[PDB]
Amino acid sequence: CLTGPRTCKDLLDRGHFLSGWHTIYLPDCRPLTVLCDMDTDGGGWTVFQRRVDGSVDFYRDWATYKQGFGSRLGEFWLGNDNIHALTAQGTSELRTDLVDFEDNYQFAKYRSFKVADEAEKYNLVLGAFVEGSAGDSLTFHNNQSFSTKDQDNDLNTGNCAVMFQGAWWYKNCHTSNLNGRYLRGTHGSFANGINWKSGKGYNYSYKVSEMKVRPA
Amino acid sequence: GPRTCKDLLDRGHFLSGWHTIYLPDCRPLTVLCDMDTDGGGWTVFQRRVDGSVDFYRDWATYKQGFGSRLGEFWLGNDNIHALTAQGTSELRTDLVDFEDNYQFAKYRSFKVADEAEKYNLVLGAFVEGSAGDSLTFHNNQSFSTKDQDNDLNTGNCAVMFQGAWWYKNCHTSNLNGRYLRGTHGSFANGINWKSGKGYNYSYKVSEMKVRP
Amino acid sequence: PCLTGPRTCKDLLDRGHFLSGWHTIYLPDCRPLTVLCDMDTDGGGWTVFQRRVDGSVDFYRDWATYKQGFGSRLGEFWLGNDNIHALTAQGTSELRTDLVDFEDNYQFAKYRSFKVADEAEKYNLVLGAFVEGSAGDSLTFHNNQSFSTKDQDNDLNTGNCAVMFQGAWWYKNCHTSNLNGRYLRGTHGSFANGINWKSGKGYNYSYKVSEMKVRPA
Ligand SMILES: *[C@@H]1O[C@H](CO[C@@H]2O[C@@H](C)[C@@H](O)[C@@H](O)[C@@H]2O)[C@@H](O[C@@H]2O[C@H](CO)[C@@H](O[C@@H]3O[C@H](CO[C@H]4O[C@H](CO)[C@@H](O)[C@H](O)[C@@H]4O)[C@@H](O)[C@H](O)[C@@H]3O)[C@H](O)[C@H]2NC(C)=O)[C@H](O)[C@H]1NC(C)=O
Ligand SMILES: CC(=O)N[C@H]1[C@@H](O)[C@H](O)[C@@H](CO)O[C@@H]1O
Ligand SMILES: CC(=O)N[C@H]1[C@@H](O)[C@H](O)[C@@H](CO)O[C@@H]1O
Ligand SMILES: [Ca+2]
Ligand SMILES: [Ca+2]
Ligand SMILES: [Ca+2]
The missing domain is CATH 4.10.530.10 (Gamma-fibrinogen Carboxyl Terminal Fragment, domain 2)
Structure with missing residues (x-):
């Protein structure tokens, strides 16, 4: 709904300051519950991949990567259809956050990030590397x-x-x-x-x- | 609107988590859906994971449910009855020991009566299980x-x-x-x-x- | 919608939400806010404004951050000083502190009333009687x-x-x-x-x- 939230960015502007699972509306206006990181680097990021404890099997097949898998309580892949839906008009940037086993944080940031649809087998369109310690x-x-x-x-x-x-x-x-x-x-x-x-x-x-x- | 974790899986919620469903009487109930195990689509009514929650509790407490969506919990006997009374539900128990050995037992059918009948257990034959x-x-x-x-x-x-x-x-x-x-x-x-x-x-x- | 719906974790418990978790309640000003409800401890019905559990979230933060809140519904967080004020502005809510060490010892401490003033008075703390608590x-x-x-x-x-x-x-x-x-x-x-x-x-x-x-109370 035009006057509904369509990104984690919107939700932040509208005053949801706490990271968590909120439902958003994609370009095609279908509802989708996503994890919003409201804390990192200014906040307002939609998280499409999370690893944290090794609880979830990631060595999975095409159908599974296509539709998504894992748990809102833990690790997950949001699913390739969704990641495409989310990056369709590639104006959105990528952040990669890595934490090691001694709690040292590093990261990397790209200017643009887009995945094509299944027809072009979820092809990766990645704009420039802007920076990052990773x-x-x-x-x-x-x-x-x-x-x-x-x-x-x-x-x-x-x-x-x-x-x-x-x-x-x-x-x-x-x-x-x-x-x-x-x-x-x-x-x-x-x-x-x-x-x-x-x-x-x-x-x-x-x-x-x-x-x-x-x-961006 | 959806009546089971099974429905939610059918409509394309592939991620385990807390979704609200609709009991056949019609009270909505926010339940934990295991979308991963054994084909997925299971409603979880009991979870132990870390020992954070006291389970040595009284009748009123077991009746209404207790614990935390963030952790351990018992969904409550009224809900478990609401949830297994109409039509036939199949039970399934997953067990993990401290040496990470996965185990289960699984039953054709599982029903608990209402409070009048003391949430009595009505169980079907053992299907299979390493436990x-x-x-x-x-x-x-x-x-x-x-x-x-x-x-x-x-x-x-x-x-x-x-x-x-x-x-x-x-x-x-x-x-x-x-x-x-x-x-x-x-x-x-x-x-x-x-x-x-x-x-x-x-x-x-x-x-x-x-x-x- | 602001009126029909719930205003405290207490109400929600009264309405039959027996499971701890994140529910939305309506501030006295009608603004919706998503809070964590502890439905289990000491009779249940508590709104949690602070939680530490694993050290995942940085708490050494500035004024603007403590003002608006920070952390994750999945984990540790501070609900934010504006919200904590919004919540206690009517001066009639009990405070409870629940602590756990690394030996699994559970201690608590309870107070009859707890209020924080607004930003103008720098979130001034108004605290009533120490009721009891093992802590x-x-x-x-x-x-x-x-x-x-x-x-x-x-x-x-x-x-x-x-x-x-x-x-x-x-x-x-x-x-x-x-x-x-x-x-x-x-x-x-x-x-x-x-x-x-x-x-x-x-x-x-x-x-x-x-x-x-x-x-x-
Ligand atoms: C909360 O603490 C305040 C003081 O703390 C300040 O204000 C708080 C709310 C925060 O902003 C803090 O950061 C501040 O530091 C206490 O205020 C004092 O209360 C006592 C009574 O309990 C007052 O004592 C009186 O003194 C008077 C003397 O004449 C004048 O003194 C000064 C000038 O020198 C003047 O500012 C004051 O207003 C008087 O006009 C007199 O009336 C009488 O004899 C009495 O002894 C004291 O004046 C107050 N201090 C201040 C800074 O105004 C609050 O009591 C406390 N609240 C509670 C509920 O405990
Ligand atoms: C681990 C994994 O991704 N495999 C799947 C599923 O996609 C396969 O169809 C099935 C084999 O029929 O194993 C599993 O159920
Ligand atoms: C929570 C908060 O607002 N502080 C920030 C940032 O502004 C600080 O400079 C840094 C302290 O090195 O902590 C954080 O990175
Ligand atoms: Ca090849
Ligand atoms: Ca007996
Ligand atoms: Ca000083």
């Missing part, structure tokens, strides 16, 4: 289909989602793997964790990870 | 709180085992017992499932949930 | 005190209490309680800069859980 380990994945174990759309003679137990805009294969296994800090296994290459490397799996959008 | 069958034993028995004794033992099961349950003479499951945190010396007064981890082990997590 | 009175001490943050010193100490004790509070000179202090996780060497309650576990112990909540 370094830029997403640009590398610009202009690439999203792949999962049962649907391969990567640039690797093998199946990247299996080789790195995740779901992602995989090329050959990745520099970031935020949907990887919740490995809890330093791990021997190679690059199959919640990893950000310019952050804590290919052998460290963050304690917390959030991916979130706001109109 | 074994530690509930059929309690079928056709009244509910008992500490302050109310409907148990078929001349002592007071509820107080001997500090919980609440359709206690008989007395129990082979005690999912509303004390949050004892794994192995305990004390006898059968924990979150215990006899064919599961035994009378001397209190699970880390416990959930009781229903689906059409 | 001891560590609040009466802070009667009649303005609320202070790091960037706005309104205390009775030639120095800055919020800085020294890394929190925010009705600091006097400075405190016997510091429930908005740093989440230090049990025993700490540093002096009185934790989630501390002096008559409770002392100046060198930071509780695992803390909640401050109100209910119409």
Whole structure:
């Protein structure tokens, strides 16, 4: 409803100062309950990805990544249809917040972030890297289909989602793997964790990870 | 508008959480929906997770419900009846020990009568379960709180085992017992499932949930 | 809609919401606000305006932030001083403090009345009789005190209490309680800069859980 809230940004302007699950209205005016981060970097971010404790299985198939999964009480992926619905007219920016197991925070911010629809297999349109202490380990994945174990759309003679137990805009294969296994800090296994290459490397799996959008 | 966690899943709520539904009498009830386990679409009426909430409670409290949407809770006997009376609901219990071993038992049908009949347990055959069958034993028995004794033992099961349950003479499951945190010396007064981890082990997590 | 609907967590309990959680109530001015209702503790029906539970949220914050509120419905939060005032402006609500240590010991402390003035009077605290509580009175001490943050010193100490004790509070000179202090996780060497309650576990112990909540008497 034109005079209803359509982003976490709106809700903030309208005086909801507490982070939490609010329902918003998408461009097409269908209602959708989302998590609003009202605290970080000015606040007003819609969170589409959350990892926090390893409670939820993220090594999932296409249908599952399509529709979303997890729990409002915990970890979740908002779902690719929704993430597209939310970024349709790409004027909204991306923030990535990582917290390690000693509670050290790092992050990264992009100017624009858009995922295409299923027809173009949730393609990643990412505008410029603006800054962040995590370094830029997403640009590398610009202009690439999203792949999962049962649907391969990567640039690797093998199946990247299996080789790195995740779901992602995989090329050959990745520099970031935020949907990887919740490995809890330093791990021997190679690059199959919640990893950000310019952050804590290919052998460290963050304690917390959030991916979130706001109109620019 | 929706009448079960099952409906909500059908209409495309894929994320577990607290949604409001509509009882067949029509009072709306905000319930926890487990959209993940075993196909999803389960309404959770009991959750233990961390020992934050006191479960050694009286009749009025078990009647109306207690605890926190943020944590542990009992949905309340009136609601559990409202919720399982009309049409047939299937039970299912998920159990997690402190060494993270997942377990369950699952029943064809599960119904609790109203207060007049003491929220009596009406249970169907065991479908399957790695936790074994530690509930059929309690079928056709009244509910008992500490302050109310409907148990078929001349002592007071509820107080001997500090919980609440359709206690008989007395129990082979005690999912509303004390949050004892794994192995305990004390006898059968924990979150215990006899064919599961035994009378001397209190699970880390416990959930009781229903689906059409 | 402002009239038909609920105005306190007490009403909601009366209306048959038996489960603790976030419900919307209507301020005396008709503005909707989403509050946390503790339907379980001490008869139930309490509106929670402060919660600490895991150390996930930064509480060492400025005036504007304490004014408007901050944190997460999923976790820790301060409801905001304007709201806490809005809620107690009619002067007839009981205060309850629920604390839990890292041994799972539960202590509480209760007061007959609790009111914070508006911003003009710097959220001045008006507190009534200590009714009882296993945690001891560590609040009466802070009667009649303005609320202070790091960037706005309104205390009775030639120095800055919020800085020294890394929190925010009705600091006097400075405190016997510091429930908005740093989440230090049990025993700490540093002096009185934790989630501390002096008559409770002392100046060198930071509780695992803390909640401050109100209910119409
Ligand atoms: C709350 O505390 C105040 C003082 O604290 C200030 O105000 C509060 C609300 C906050 O803003 C704080 O930050 C401030 O620091 C107490 O006020 C005092 O009360 C006592 C009585 O209990 C008064 O004592 C009287 O003194 C009078 C003397 O003449 C004049 O003195 C000064 C000038 O020197 C003048 O400001 C004052 O108003 C008098 O005109 C006299 O009437 C009589 O003999 C009596 O002894 C004292 O004056 C008050 N102080 C101030 C700063 O005005 C409140 O009592 C307390 N409230 C409660 C309920 O406890
Ligand atoms: C873990 C996962 O994502 N797999 C699914 C579901 O999508 C599959 O269809 C099913 C196999 O028929 O397993 C599960 O039920
Ligand atoms: C809560 C609040 O308003 N304070 C902020 C910011 O303004 C501060 O500079 C910082 C202190 O280094 O804490 C925070 O980052
Ligand atoms: Ca391939
Ligand atoms: Ca008896
Ligand atoms: Ca000062």
